Amino acid sequence: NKASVVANQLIPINTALTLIMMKAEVVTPMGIPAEEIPNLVGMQVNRAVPLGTTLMPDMVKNYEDGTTSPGLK
């Protein structure tokens, strides 16, 4: 329904994310929404993210949204 965050360029494992890298586009699969765009920025991932790769929950190491499953590692 809404636009999800997808990596515009290709980044290796453990790479800091930036605003110009994360793109809020409405494409599948629906990974992480653009709610914590400025918050997730700076943190690195545990898996590799090629071009046009949506933000996945398993790819993020320490999730910033501490609601139910995501939160502290």
Swiss-Prot record:
Chain intervals for the UniProt region annotation (Linker): 65-70
Tissue-wise expression: Detected in blood serum (at protein level).
Domain of life: Eukaryota
AFP-like domain: residues covered: 4-63
Subcellular location per the Swiss-Prot or TrEMBL entry: Secreted
GO cellular component: extracellular region
Coiled coil (residue ranges): none
Residues annotated as site: Important for ice-binding: Q9, N14, T18, Q44
Entry keywords, A to Z: Antifreeze protein, Repeat, Secreted
Broad class of the protein's primary localization: secreted
Family recorded in the similarity comment: Belongs to the type-III AFP family.
Job of this protein: Contributes to protect fish blood from freezing at subzero sea water temperatures. Lowers the blood freezing point. Binds to nascent ice crystals and prevents further growth.
UniProt-recorded name of the protein: Ice-structuring protein RD3
Species in which this protein is naturally found: Lycodichthys dearborni (Antarctic eelpout)
Portion held of the full protein: 1 to 73 of 134
